[PDB]
Amino acid sequence: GGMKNLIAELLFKLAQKEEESKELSAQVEALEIIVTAMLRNMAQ
Amino acid sequence: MKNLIAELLFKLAQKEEESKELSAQVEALEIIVTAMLRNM
Ligand SMILES: [Cl-]
Ligand SMILES: [Cl-]
Ligand SMILES: [Cl-]
Ligand SMILES: [Cl-]
Ligand SMILES: [Cl-]
Ligand SMILES: [Cl-]
Ligand SMILES: [Cl-]
Ligand SMILES: [Cl-]
User: Could you list the residue ranges forming a coiled coil in this record (chain A)?
Assistant: First the structure.
């Protein structure tokens, strides 16, 4: 019924946000490495 | 089951907040990289 469906929808939303979060984390790490590289470059 | 819903919701909330923070970070870092690129 409604509660089980709600649970399903919540779990799906959760799965989505988890994937999204992992992607964002990956991006943050990438960007951090890039910035660090350029700062090390500026330090010469 | 009600427990399951509650915990699911909690976890979800946590993930949403995490995603918010991370998105903010990506924005900041993108601005930074853009600046440092325009610099070089
Ligand atoms: Cl929902
Ligand atoms: Cl999925
Ligand atoms: Cl994304
Ligand atoms: Cl990476
Ligand atoms: Cl340095
Ligand atoms: Cl119940
Ligand atoms: Cl930030
Ligand atoms: Cl960029």
Answer: 3-38
